[PDB]
Structures are given as C-alpha cells and as structure tokens.
C-alpha cells in the first residue's frame, strides 16, 4: 500500500467508474458507513478512510500542531485524493468531516462534484447573533469530565450522542470506538472541534451541498441546517430526517440509507 493509504487505513471497494468518498466524524471510524457501503459497490469505487487520531490509527502519527485546526485534516484528505489519483468524487462527510471536506473543496473545487453533509455544523458555540446549541460552560463541563475519568465519560457520552435505547447495538459500537482513542488525543480533538468556527468560509463554497441531519441531534439544532443552506455560496438543499441521533447512518440505517442514496443519485438544480 501507499504510505498515505496505509496510515489512514484506506480501502477502495467496488467496481464502478465514479468515485465516492465516505468520511467519518469524531469518536468513530470508517465502520460507521457499514450499512451504506453494500448499496454503492456497483455504481462506484467507494473510498473509505480513517481520520488521524481515531482509535484505529497509530497515535504516534497524531501531530498536535498539525491537527490544532481543521486545515490539517483537510490536507490529509487532499493527500488521500492525490495518492489515489481521483479525478473527482462525491464527498459524504459526517459531522466534522463535513467541514473538513468543505475546507478541502475551497482549495480544490475541481475534485468535488458535490458534498453531502451528515450532522454538520459550522459552529457549536452560541453568541447573541448565532445559535449553535452550546455555551462555554457546557464545553467546560464536558472537558472536565473527559479529563477526570475518560472510561466513565465514554460510557455516559455514547448513549447521548447516538440517541434512542441506551443498550442498542449502535451505542455498544460507538462506546467502544470512543474508548479506543488515546484519552489525551480524544480530549484535544474534541476541544478543537467544539471551538471551531467555519462560518466565514461558507460563502466561498463553489460545489453543491446537500445538508442532511436528524431532527433531534444533541449537537446540531435544526436551525444550523438552515444556516448552512443560507450561507453556503452556491446551490444547496436541506433534508431534516425523522430520526434521532448524531450518527443516524449507524443507528437508523433503514430510514437513513435511502435518504443518503437519494442525495447521491440526484443533483440540485443550478
């Protein structure tokens, strides 16, 4: 394998000519896509990869300076696309990966035919002019709990992030991938995400964006989907689903996979 391919656990599955890239969010890995991948293998070559810092990656590769902003993750994405010789792709970004792909597409819009965002937000912190869902005190509480007992935090946080039954298979899976991260890496990354502010780059986006989220998402109020739709600088469309949870492609695939497939297969009018 190539050096980038190996470092990110890259897989290229399927036999189609066109490319689709599936990019996961915090606390999980490329297995979050397991219910979607089987539906894509004839139409596409499906590119899966893990973000640096996920529990499936080598913690020795986690450069704290490199990843102190989302730009470091966007470089990694562009490096993968370059090594794999992608001409263009549909990019499906979950949670923070929606903004990572957005940043990458501003540097190389030719590589992105469309961006599909799942559970995305350009900013979590409130202020008197913008509702993202969180106050600084909420973050301080979260980070204090993470740092004081990481194992206990994973078990309490997973059911909140996934939503629904606390004993579900999806809660099981997510609690395990959370706890497979090195605690200092997880803490550092979650701080970086929570304090991010991508609002000012949305107007520069030049690739069509499909904005999908659960109607009940603990980290993404529905008004954020409308905010993305308003401020993205080219055509976009919003679909709020009748689901609960931040990883709905994992916890409610019977509802969510058809929605993603629809946005993969149909385009927004120019």
Q: Rounded CA gap, 63 and 185, in Å?
A: 10
Judged by DSSP in three states, 58 sits in coil
Of 130, 98, 127, the C-alpha closest to 114 is 98
Please check whether residue 32 is in contact with residue 119, taking contact to mean a CB–CB distance below 8 angstroms.
no
Strand order, beta sheet including 18-23: 11-13, 44-49, 18-23, 89-94, 112-118, 209-216, 236-244
| Catalytic center residues | 95, 217, 246
Q: What determination technique applies here? A: X-ray
The secondary structure of residue 181, as a DSSP letter, is: S
Four-point Cα dihedral 190, 195, 200, 204, nearest 10: -10
DSSP string, 73-115: HHHHHHHHHHHTT-S-EEEEEETHHHHHHHHHHHH-GGGEEEE
Please check whether residue 197 is in contact with residue 33, taking contact to mean a CB–CB distance below 8 angstroms.
no
Please check whether residue 117 is in contact with residue 98, taking contact to mean a CB–CB distance below 8 angstroms.
yes
Q: Rounded CA gap, 105 and 167, in Å?
A: 38
Of 56, 248, 257, 256, the C-alpha closest to 168 is 248
Q: Rounded CA gap, 70 and 201, in Å?
A: 12
**Secondary structure element (H or E) that encloses residue 204, with its range:** none
Q: Rounded CA gap, 51 and 134, in Å?
A: 25
**Secondary structure element (H or E) that encloses residue 222, with its range:** helix 222-231
Half-sphere exposure of 166 (CA within 13 A, CB side): 6
Four-point Cα dihedral 106, 110, 116, 120, nearest 10: -10
The neighbour count for residue 152, using CB atoms within 10 Å, is 11
The neighbour count for residue 17, using CB atoms within 10 Å, is 8
Angle at 121 (CA atoms; ends 264, 228), nearest 5 degrees:
65
Domain boundaries, the chain: 1-270
Burial of 167 per CB tally in 10 Å (0-12, 13-18, 19+): exposed
Tell me the helix, strand and coil percentages in the chain, rounded to 5: 45, 20, 35
Please check whether residue 2 is in contact with residue 81, taking contact to mean a CB–CB distance below 8 angstroms.
no
Please check whether residue 246 is in contact with residue 162, taking contact to mean a CB–CB distance below 8 angstroms.
yes
Q: Strand ranges (DSSP E) for the chain?
A: 11-13, 18-23, 44-49, 89-94, 112-118, 209-216, 236-244
Judged by DSSP in three states, 208 sits in coil
Can you give the C-alpha Rg of the chain in angstroms? 17
């Amino acid at each position: 394998m190539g050096i980038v391919e190996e470092a990110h656990n890259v897989k290229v599955l399927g036999t189609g000519s066109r490319f689709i890239v599936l990019a996961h969010g915090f606390g999980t890995d490329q297995s979050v896509w397991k219910h979607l991948v089987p539906h894509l293998l004839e139409e596409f070559r499906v590119i899966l990869y893990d973000n640096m810092g996920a529990g499936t990656t080598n913690p020795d590769y986690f450069d704290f300076e490199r990843y102190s902003t989302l730009e470091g993750y966007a470089y990694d994405l562009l490096a993968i696309l370059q090594e794999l010789r992608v001409d263009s792709c549909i990019f499906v970004g979950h949670s923070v990966s929606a903004m990572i792909g957005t940043v990458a597409s501003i540097s190389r819009p030719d590589l992105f035919a469309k961006i599909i965002m799942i559970s995305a937000s350009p900013r979590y912190l409130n202020d008197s002019n913008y509702f993202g869902g969180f106050e600084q005190e909420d973050l301080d509480q979260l980070f204090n709990a993470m740092a004081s007992n990481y194992k206990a935090w994973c078990s309490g946080f997973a059911p909140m992030a996934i939503g629904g039954d606390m004993e579900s298979v999806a809660v099981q899976e997510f609690s395990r991938t959370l706890f497979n991260m090195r605690p200092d890496i997880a803490l550092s990354v979650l701080q970086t995400i929570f304090k991010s502010d991508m609002r000012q780059i949305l107007c520069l986006v030049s690739v069509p964006c499909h904005i999908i989220q659960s109607m009940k998402d603990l980290a993404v109020p529905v008004v954020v989907a409308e905010y993305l739709h308003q401020h993205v600088g080219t055509e976009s469309i919003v679909e709020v689903m009748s689901t609960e949870g931040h990883l709905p492609q994992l916890s409610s695939p019977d509802v969510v996979i058809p929605v993603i497939l629809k946005h993969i297969r149909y385009d927004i009018v120019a």
